[PDB]
Amino acid sequence: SYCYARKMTDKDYIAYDNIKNFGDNYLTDYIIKTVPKYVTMAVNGPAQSSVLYQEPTIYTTPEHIYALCAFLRDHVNLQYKTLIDITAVDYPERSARFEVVYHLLSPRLNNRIRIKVVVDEVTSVPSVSRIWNAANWFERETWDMFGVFFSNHPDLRRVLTDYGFTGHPLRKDFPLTGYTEVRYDYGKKRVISEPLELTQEFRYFDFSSPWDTLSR
Amino acid sequence: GTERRPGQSGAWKQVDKQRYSSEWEQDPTFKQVPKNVSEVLDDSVSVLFLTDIVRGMMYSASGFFDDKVTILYPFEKGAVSPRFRGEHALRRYPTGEERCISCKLCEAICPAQAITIEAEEREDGSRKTTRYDIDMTKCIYCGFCQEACPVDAIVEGPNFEFSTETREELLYDKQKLLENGDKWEQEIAANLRTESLYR
Amino acid sequence: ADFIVSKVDTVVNWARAGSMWPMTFGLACCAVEMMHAGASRYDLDRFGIIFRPSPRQSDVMIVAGTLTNKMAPALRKVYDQMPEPKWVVSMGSCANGGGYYHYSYSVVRGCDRVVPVDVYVPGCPPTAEGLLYGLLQLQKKIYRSKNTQLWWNK
Amino acid sequence: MNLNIIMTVLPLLVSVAFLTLSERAVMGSLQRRMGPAVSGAFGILQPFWDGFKLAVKEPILPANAAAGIFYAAPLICICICVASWCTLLLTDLSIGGLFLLLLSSLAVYGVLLAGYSCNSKYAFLGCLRSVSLMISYELVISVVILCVILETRDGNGFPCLNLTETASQTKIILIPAGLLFYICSLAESKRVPFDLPEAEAELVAGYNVEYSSLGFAVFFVAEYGNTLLMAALINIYFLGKLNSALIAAIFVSFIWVRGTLPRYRYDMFMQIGWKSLLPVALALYLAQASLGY
Amino acid sequence: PKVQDVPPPGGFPSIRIERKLPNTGPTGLAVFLGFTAFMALAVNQARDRKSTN
Amino acid sequence: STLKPFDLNANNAVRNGPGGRSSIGGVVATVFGANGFIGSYVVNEISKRGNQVVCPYRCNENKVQPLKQMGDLGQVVLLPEFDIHDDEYIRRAISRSNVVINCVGIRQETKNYSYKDVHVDFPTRLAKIVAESGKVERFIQVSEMGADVSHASRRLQTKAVGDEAIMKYIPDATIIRPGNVVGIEDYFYNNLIFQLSYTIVAPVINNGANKVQPTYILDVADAVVKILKDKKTSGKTYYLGGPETLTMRQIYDHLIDTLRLSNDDTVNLRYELAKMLYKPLDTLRTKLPEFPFLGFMMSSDYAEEQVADSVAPAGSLGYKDLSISPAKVTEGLAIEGVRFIRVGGYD
Amino acid sequence: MKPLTPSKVSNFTINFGPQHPAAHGVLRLVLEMDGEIIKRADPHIGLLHRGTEKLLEYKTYNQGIPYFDRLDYVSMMCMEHSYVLAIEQLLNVAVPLRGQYIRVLFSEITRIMNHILAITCHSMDVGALTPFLWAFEEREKLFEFYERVSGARMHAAYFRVGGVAQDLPIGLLRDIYDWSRQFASRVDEMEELLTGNRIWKERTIDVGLVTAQQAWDWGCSGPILRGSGIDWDLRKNQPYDVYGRMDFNVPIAGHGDCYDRYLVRVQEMRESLRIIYQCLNEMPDGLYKTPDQKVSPPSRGQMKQSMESLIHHFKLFSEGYHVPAGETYRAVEAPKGEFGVYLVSRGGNRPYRCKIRSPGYAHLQMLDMVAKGAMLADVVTIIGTLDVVFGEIDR
């Protein structure tokens, strides 16, 4: 649960053997078997915690996210008491463009899990703030950068971008430089926004090789 | 020290808790009731005579007489290592021929896109640049361009006194960079000879 | 009279330049280099440069950091509150020309777009001695001015 | 008039300028720094630059405030300092020290008018905080003075608070009250242990920051002048005949104690003055009206 | 090259890491006794002054 | 709306871009008097559209600081030492310039410079120097509306004589003749306010009968742009009066109203008395340096120009010919500056 | 038939603007206060949002390393370290032992300066200015080590994929060891002025109280966890370099108040000194960067003597290496907490998505819960213990 300091000396171990095994190789199967309706697919890959281990990635749908998160936090064997961050990735090639990613920590299990909800521009994702209070700002940032609406959020507002910003900057279709620029005018003694002009344009250098194979 | 008094606290509610409850005596960090007359006098004189204050006063007063650490900036200058990344400079061969061969790698590696290069064949037949300008208001002085150059043409010199009164003077060009290389040639060469051993 | 006016203007230049009250608009990385420049090892208070928290009592303003579209109105508002001499120093690549965030939707390409800049200090971050070199360049600019002589022959 | 007014006023101005210099020199000492050295060579001539340059800065027209009161506050501070020093050096008033106590109770006005000039709802509370400090520690100073008159008797045997007569003899009885006087003098000059302002004042809570060129000069000069008057009072009551070195040493002790101490929160130093200093000062006033005659 | 910055043969000499508790010196009782003595002297001086006056 | 070209020869070749700060406009301008109230806004208008402005100024770095922000890199060129009597400097200043704007004028006389020098000699000398070049295509001179050869005030008379000299040397010059210009840095409302508030009594010449047509600074600045965007405007004088004609008494009353002054501090200093009080003080001015205490208001020339009606002649060119609707100077944004002082809910 | 009881209303929606004795950067804070007591705090951020995450997408992997140095100007090395670790995980690149030691050593050095700045700037915010100036001389000594290894005092960009940019200059290990011989005494000097001081105690005790459950709920890390009683350190629980070899003890406190976190940070400085001494004594000999030249640049003589090395140099300084398709989140124990990078690669030479997990973002989110019932003066201390950096908060 909460890693309250217990052992005063000789706590050199990273964790116990049984706790490591249950999470090294049974964690995804345990999740799938215990809560099958929530899970659609699972990926075991390079570990977030370390290079040597393997950590799970679970794909779930927007409707089941709140119950899956509640199960992950409070299940006795799986205690993901912490939400590291919430993130979205824009995939314009896909019909469901946005992949909302949740990163969690179990201090007891010493393990990291990644939860993905695949949505589009119109659909909304239920807020998980009641499960983790840290989610509020992360979902506000996801709304600002990518435009993903989070349902039942206490107050969904933009955080990073300028006041009056309507576009979502981290969308792959948003220009790198944006659309507007800010300058002070002497005539009107105000700082004003104007359409963009660049003295020197951004130079995109195409370095791709025909012979490369790693590109997917 | 770390030990705390029941009275001293920064939060009103905690002060109320400690004023009206004796759970603080269970806690190990707090200081317990004196339980002797002499201990009562000790604590009372400690609080009333501002003892802890004076102890800091002497250690601070050590500051008055200890050796001041300061540098007269114009007369004395801070130590600068050979690796130091400062004002950029294009370099020439000892014959007087520019080392630049317009590979354009430094412009490709520039994280900030501060270098614009365009070249031509010279009349003799050499691959030489007709333009090499660096925006010093866009440079981040990473030194990647000095790393990518295969002929040591571009180096970040040891000069950090290059403030200007207008931004246009901070848009360097090939002639200015070559002049900067000429001005600092010997220092740059010594630094490069030292640096060559490591890398 | 032309000699007396010159003596007055050089004394006034000495007074203005020796006692520079800078206000530091410390957005980002460069403010800490300024922190170091005003520390024990470099004594700016020996130079007569001592930082003042409010704009009304500051005659020189140092923009040290990346100016964003969200902040530029506040930068201009702070600049307008300053008194008449109001010299402005731009420190760092971010303040000088946007620098490494130049091609960004949220970054102003140079504080010169928002406020007039007298001296540009280049670096990322500018070395503290470089900042003192820029401050001495501004001090020379103040010494160069001969306002009282120009007043006599205006 | 009298020529003595000149011989009192002029040394005061020179002394305040070099007090302002002394403060930062001592700071450089604590912090392994050095006194300013580009202004000249000796450094005698540093504060004069600040004054003369401050004459140069172009005036700002008053904004959203009544002009009369805004002009009034600097004149009040400059009047009080001159009256205090010239009644400390050039008068025979039987109760002169009580007159100095009265002139210190009028220093609440300068801050208070400067606060009223702001007319900000936040500035109201900030200026009220400052004046609350000043009055709360003026009470304890009054009790300490009651202690001082108690051993102060003239050759004819008449009780009095004539400054030369309290200066004549040094009483080690009174020293317990002199410690409280020194702490309260720190409080009344708004030194760091009681410098509630600097934290509140970085955002514009409300203080002489509004004043700009010559009004601002006289306030800061008056602050140092009041600190020097407190040093002179500490000398004359508790440490015998008036000595210039002792006065300046008490001022340097102010700077040292400041440097070694962090600031107090508003409720903290207010609770110190009422629940700690005042009972001790009443206990010593008992101890002095009740050590006897 | 083959010569790089390596720790010296035999290793570096040991350093101090933990804090030093220097809290030695005067404590409460002696200050009370000295203050009492100084009060007694002050009382006697006041007595003499008040009779002479 | 469609952007209209700057009607300058071969502009079509050089011009490129949207018309903004970083775009290229084919106008290189030498604006004399750039650091002044009128000149700064003209520099702002020209430089805002990507053009290059050369600003000759008498050595004063702090006064010309706002002009630095006006344009992109290399667009605002500040020449340090400007003298009206130096021919070589004037030739250097207009070397690359295809339009020259003259905003150099003095409200009052001093010992160094009189009206006849600044308002007559400089226009004639500059006119000859511009005429010999030939590269300069457009010339604009800024003058007062009330300027006339048969005017009692020496300032308004010398200005008209200098304008006639300019018309003689360059026949294609345009004479912009705005009224009392209202702005944040203006000398109309600011001086009136200072008179009402920090002066013992506010003397009003006669009873405020004199009629005036004040105009906002942005309107005059836009009018300059419209002059430069049309070649048909060349050789014509435009009286850029404001939308509303107002007597001076109305403006004083309305300033008192907006500032919510307790009562009327204005007094009746009728003419024939100012002509005796200020007449020696003019001779005082011509023998003493610039002094803040007394100026502009405290002169016989000001009284003489405040006894006449400075209004546009009936048959005349104006804002309508330039397709500009002037904004009212007694309401809206124009009056915000005086509004910030006091509006009765303020302080 | 029993009377109801009415309540009171809160007003005074103050705006606390950019304020110098606070955590460095620009903070706009909207505070709703009932009288002199705060009822809601709403931090306004985005004043230093430079669009870093989107800019990364347009740069190559090696071109994007300097972004991480400038995300947090106090702790550069720890910030770039997570990025290079994530690229190494996706690339399956093994770091030589000497480079692993150099990374751990300089990470501990930047940790120490971060803690020095945090503690002394917090004391300055309280109002004590002597520890602050007493600390800049130490911080200068450590900046001198940086300028020696990289040529830049602040933005070194020294950590690279597969090792370090250059090898340690000769004589550096001796100088670091001397600074270490005197560091403990300097820290004790600072500790006496702060610790044991009645005014400091009164200002900091029982201010900003956090409990372990609250810390896990709000996603806090580092000193905030360890000041409340949580024995969790990434360097020990999830080692990422030769940290596993290193011998050091986690500092733990239980109250959660401001004072406990200050004590934790001082002890963390001491533990970092111990780790540095171990690094100095056990520093191995050999390669400092990975032998593979398809992910690391060749040496200059080698590029000037070999065709394959010139080809590799050209294609690494123009195109860069290609990172295999995959996703990874690598976190490091930064001085301010846990800093992680979520890197998504589709197989190209540029990152497709580089999410930066801010340790200070969650602390600023926790500000409201912590600063409830406090006073206007307490906010400065509470901000000081969070030690938030707004370039780090606003990416």
Ligand SMILES: CCCCCCCCCCCCCCCCCCCC(=O)O[C@H](COC(=O)CCCCCCCCCCCCCC)COP(=O)(O)OCCN
């Ligand atoms: C015990 C003996 C038995 C006999 C009985 C005699 C009783 C004492 C009579 C002696 C008279 C002298 C007393 C000196 C003044 C102290 C007044 C009370 C002391 C006190 O309460 O401590 C703090 C007040 O001092 C402060 O902290 C104020 C702030 C001070 C900052 C400036 C310091 C200046 C340097 C000190 C003066 C030195 C002068 C020469 C340089 C309060 O705080 P608390 O909360 O702990 O107490 C409340 C705990 N319920």
Ligand SMILES: NC(=O)C1=CN([C@@H]2O[C@H](COP(=O)(O)OP(=O)(O)OC[C@H]3O[C@@H](n4cnc5c(N)ncnc54)[C@H](OP(=O)(O)O)[C@@H]3O)[C@@H](O)[C@H]2O)C=CC1
């Ligand atoms: N109310 C108004 O503003 C109106 C103005 N006008 C006319 O427009 C012109 C300027 O308007 P305004 O800008 O308000 O006047 P300003 O005095 O504000 O601008 C005058 C400019 O001319 C320069 N100047 C004056 N004398 C000399 C000289 N002897 N040698 C060199 N430069 C000199 C000044 O520079 P320095 O600052 O160094 O003197 C300043 O830049 C004036 O002729 C005025 O009559 C037209 C209608 C109304």
Ligand code: SF4
């Ligand atoms: S140092 Fe870096 S940013 Fe500057 S020019 Fe070279 S590669 Fe570009």
Ligand code: SF4
């Ligand atoms: S400076 Fe070096 S890297 Fe840049 S173009 Fe010339 S040879 Fe190539």
Ligand code: SF4
């Ligand atoms: S110029 Fe460089 S050091 Fe300065 S604020 Fe910008 S990124 Fe930081």
